[PDB]
Amino acid sequence: PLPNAVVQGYTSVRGPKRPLDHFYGRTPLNIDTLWHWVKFPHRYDNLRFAVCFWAFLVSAHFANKKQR
Amino acid sequence: FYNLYNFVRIGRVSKYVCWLSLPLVFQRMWMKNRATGMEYDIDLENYAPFEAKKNPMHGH
Amino acid sequence: SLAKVWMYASWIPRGIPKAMANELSSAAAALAHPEAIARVAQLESQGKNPYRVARA
Amino acid sequence: APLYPVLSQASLYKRHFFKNIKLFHVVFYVGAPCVTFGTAAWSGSNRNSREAIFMVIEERHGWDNFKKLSSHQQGVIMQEAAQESLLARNKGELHLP
Amino acid sequence: TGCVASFPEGDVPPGAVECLPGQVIRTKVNGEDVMLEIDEVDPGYQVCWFKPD
Ligand SMILES: CCCCCCCCCCCCO[C@@H]1O[C@H](CO)[C@@H](O[C@H]2O[C@H](CO)[C@@H](O)[C@H](O)[C@H]2O)[C@H](O)[C@H]1O
Ligand SMILES: COCCOCCOCCOc1ccc(C(C)(C)CC(C)(C)C)cc1
Ligand SMILES: COCCOCCOCCOc1ccc(C(C)(C)CC(C)(C)C)cc1
Numbered sequence: 001p002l003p004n005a006v007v008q009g010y011t012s013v014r015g016p017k018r019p020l021d022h023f024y025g026r027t028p029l030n031i032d033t034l035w036h037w038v039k040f041p042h043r044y045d046n047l048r049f050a051v052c053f054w055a056f057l058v059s060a061h062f063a064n065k066k067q068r
Numbered sequence: 069f070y071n072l073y074n075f076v077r078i079g080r081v082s083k084y085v086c087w088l089s090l091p092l093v094f095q096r097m098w099m100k101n102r103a104t105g106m107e108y109d110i111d112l113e114n115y116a117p118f119e120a121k122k123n124p125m126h127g128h
Numbered sequence: 129s130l131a132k133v134w135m136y137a138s139w140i141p142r143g144i145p146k147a148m149a150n151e152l153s154s155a156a157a158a159l160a161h162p163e164a165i166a167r168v169a170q171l172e173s174q175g176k177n178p179y180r181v182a183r184a
Numbered sequence: 185a186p187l188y189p190v191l192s193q194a195s196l197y198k199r200h201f202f203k204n205i206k207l208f209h210v211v212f213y214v215g216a217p218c219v220t221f222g223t224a225a226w227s228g229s230n231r232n233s234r235e236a237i238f239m240v241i242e243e244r245h246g247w248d249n250f251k252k253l254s255s256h257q258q259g260v261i262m263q264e265a266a267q268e269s270l271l272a273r274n275k276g277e278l279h280l281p
Numbered sequence: 282t283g284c285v286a287s288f289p290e291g292d293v294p295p296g297a298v299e300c301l302p303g304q305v306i307r308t309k310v311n312g313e314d315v316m317l318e319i320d321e322v323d324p325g326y327q328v329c330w331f332k333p334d
């Protein structure tokens with residue numbers, strides 16, 4: 001279906017690929033290495049519960065007053 | 069509250085039944101807000117007002 | 129002082145859920161198995177959120 | 185004694201984040217929000233149900249009168265129109281030409 | 282499992298299950314299934330069940 005050149009990636013000679021840099025002494029920085037810096041929110045979860053309650057309540061209050 | 073709920077812990081039937089009347093509270097909470105702004109026909113409200121005074125069809 | 133003014137102004141807002149909050153806390157202390165409460169205290173001593181742990 | 189503007193280690197560390205992308209890292213990561221919130225699933229469904237809704241409204245009630253009504257009754261009539269169109273009682277319940 | 286220990290009053294170690302007066306404990310003592318009811322823990326002291334963890 002396809003010639004061997006397309007599969008192996010070269011017609012005659014296999015060219016050397018420059019390897020990937022590492023940046024010794026620190027973590028890799030890639031699109032997939034970002035969870036090292038940004039975990040899921042874990043610090044303000046209970047504050048999230050409180051603020052969700054208060055937001056619901058205040059919205060309901062002002063909406064009911066407006067409607068009435 | 070800890071005393072009351074420590075006694076609720078010791079019950080057998082009420083601790084699994086007396087809560088089933090509580091959804092009804094939220095039913096009222098929701099229906100009241102539905103009714104606070106419900107749009108209605110002026111003609112039916114003027115012809116058939118609910119529990120309005122001086123309606124001769126009621127008697128007074 | 130201004131702190132007293134803020135206290136007397138936020139008293140009525142702050143206290144609307146305190147009843148239900150204390151009710152839930154006390155009902156948890158009463159109805160929940162004490163081993164679960166001890167595990168919660170342990171996990172909070174370990175810096176973890178035991179609610180997220182339980183959900184997971 | 186380099187005569188060129190030598191680039192710091194941290195600047196290269198940051199540029200590597202941008203140039204070390206692979207094809208799949210773009211394709212799938214951008215296709216998931218795209219396929220979900222695109223002309224297929226969400227944006228398409230919304231924006232194509234709106235057309236039928238307002239066709240039904242302007243045929244049955246009128247756009248000006250609809251504008252005069254409340255947001256609640258607006259939504260009620262919009263939902264009725266969406267149901268009328270999804271049903272497609274005249275097309276034999278078939279969304280084809 | 283674990284152990285029951287007496288230690289001075291104050292802060293409870295996190296993970297220990299307090300065993301206050303009135304606490305009932307189903308255990309096995311010398312092959313005998315028993316209930317232990319705590320009564321009159323001494324002052325300046327408290328008792329807790331410490332699992333191995
Ligand atoms: C089967 C019925 C008849 C139809 C036959 C033809 C079908 C063609 C469709 C399949 C195409 C697959 O296409 C595939 O693309 C990749 C790109 O990642 C090529 O990949 C090639 O190039 C890359 C770089 O670009 C090289 O590093 C790699 O070594 C080499 O394999 C494959 O050689 C080719 O096979
Ligand atoms: C809208 O999205 C914003 C995109 O921009 C992201 C901004 O990123 C800058 C982050 O800045 C730093 C720099 C260093 C760090 C350190 C190295 C201190 C984090 C560490 C110690 C956890 C590794 C954290 C954040
Ligand atoms: C989903 O992710 C969205 C937000 O992600 C932000 C990621 O930010 C990470 C930034 O990476 C760094 C970290 C540290 C650094 C410094 C310069 C602080 C490192 C140093 C001091 C070792 C050179 C630079 C870039």
Ligand SMILES: COCCOCCOCCOc1ccc(C(C)(C)CC(C)(C)C)cc1
Nearest residue numbers: 009204205206207208209210211212213215
């Ligand atoms: C029958 O085949 C079905 C599979 O087809 C899936 C289509 O995927 C779309 C593109 O997917 C990719 C993604 C990355 C790549 C590689 C990893 C080869 C990219 C490269 C060359 C940058 C490393 C190849 C194809």
